[PDB]
Design an enzyme around this catalytic site. Structure first.
Site, PDB file in Angstrom:
ATOM      1  CG  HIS A  37      -0.413   0.441   2.654  1.00 47.01           C
ATOM      2  ND1 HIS A  37      -0.173  -0.342   3.550  1.00 47.01           N
ATOM      3  CD2 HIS A  37      -0.322   1.796   2.962  1.00 47.01           C
ATOM      4  CE1 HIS A  37       0.272  -0.137   4.814  1.00 47.01           C
ATOM      5  NE2 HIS A  37       0.229   1.563   4.203  1.00 47.01           N
ATOM      6  N   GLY A  77       3.102   6.202   8.833  1.00 41.34           N
ATOM      7  CA  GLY A  77       4.568   6.457   8.348  1.00 41.34           C
ATOM      8  C   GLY A  77       5.563   5.115   8.867  1.00 41.34           C
ATOM      9  N   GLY A 133       5.173  -0.556   6.041  1.00 46.45           N
ATOM     10  CA  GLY A 133       6.218  -1.181   5.151  1.00 46.45           C
ATOM     11  C   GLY A 133       7.293  -1.524   6.019  1.00 46.45           C
TER      12      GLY A 133
END
Ligand SMILES: [Ca+2]
Length: 240
Positions: free
Chosen positions: A45, A186, A189
């Protein structure tokens, strides 16, 4: 990372900052893990918008050049072919980025260790999330890399109606849920590093938190389970 502390400088040397170009500037958007000298693992994403991306390795402070950083462009983006941007809960939130150059490994820039295919941790296993994400729900990105202890919550507990229920699948790892510490925007990932036989390995790729906020009791942070994707990762690197 909510509820964390500043990491020792360069003490998670596989952690990368994924940044996108905004006019003449670069902005941090997500984390990732360096897995080869020219490959980074992150969430799908994070990279399914059409931006120009770069990877920063050896980063600690996002707002000052520390001298340990190396800045490299992204040459190819391989998102898992089953990812659906509209359905994060369906899973497959993983992507591999092939870098434009191989980075130089050193004290500050190291490859992350991945688990063997199919490895599952016991409930309440010791892990840390790292990242530069918001340090409060609806707050501000961290300037310096943060870490927080987030013990695992096994699939049976995490998919119970008292936790996430059917929103979580067994291709995910849940960790935290104490209401104090969590991943936040933030951090997506980036890694969940879990201690196995005295060595940290990257067992999760940060994927989502509750719509009600980052640190919400019995809504652990949810990660893509790296060990479910070892065949996929090796297939991509072998063929790209
Ligand atoms: Ca820096």
């Amino acid at each position: 990372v909510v509820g964390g502390t500043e990491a020792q400088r360069n003490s998670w040397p596989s952690q990368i900052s994924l940044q996108y170009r905004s006019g003449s500037s670069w902005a941090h958007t997500c984390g990732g893990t360096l897995i080869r000298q020219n490959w980074v693992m992150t969430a799908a994403h994070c990279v399914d918008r059409e931006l120009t991306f770069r990877v920063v390795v050896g980063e600690h402070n996002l707002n000052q050049n520390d001298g340990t950083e190396q800045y490299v462009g992204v040459q190819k983006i391989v998102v898992h072919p089953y990812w659906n941007t509209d359905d994060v809960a369906a899973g497959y939130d993983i992507a591999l980025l092939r870098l434009a150059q191989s980075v130089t490994l050193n004290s500050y820039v190291q490859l992350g260790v991945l688990p063997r295919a199919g490895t599952i941790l016991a409930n309440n296993s010791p892990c840390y999330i790292t990242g530069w994400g918001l340090t409060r729900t609806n707050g501000q990105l961290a300037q310096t890399l943060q870490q927080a202890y987030l013990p695992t919550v096994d699939y049976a507990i995490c998919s119970s109606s008292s936790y996430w229920g059917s929103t979580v699948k067994n291709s995910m790892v849940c960790a935290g849920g104490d209401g104090v510490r969590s991943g936040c925007q933030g951090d997506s990932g980036g890694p969940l590093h879990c201690l196995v036989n005295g060595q940290y390995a990257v067992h999760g790729v940060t994927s989502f938190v509750s719509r009600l906020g980052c640190n919400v009791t019995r809504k652990p942070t949810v990660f893509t389970r790296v060990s479910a994707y070892i065949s996929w990762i090796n297939n991509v690197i072998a063929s790209n």
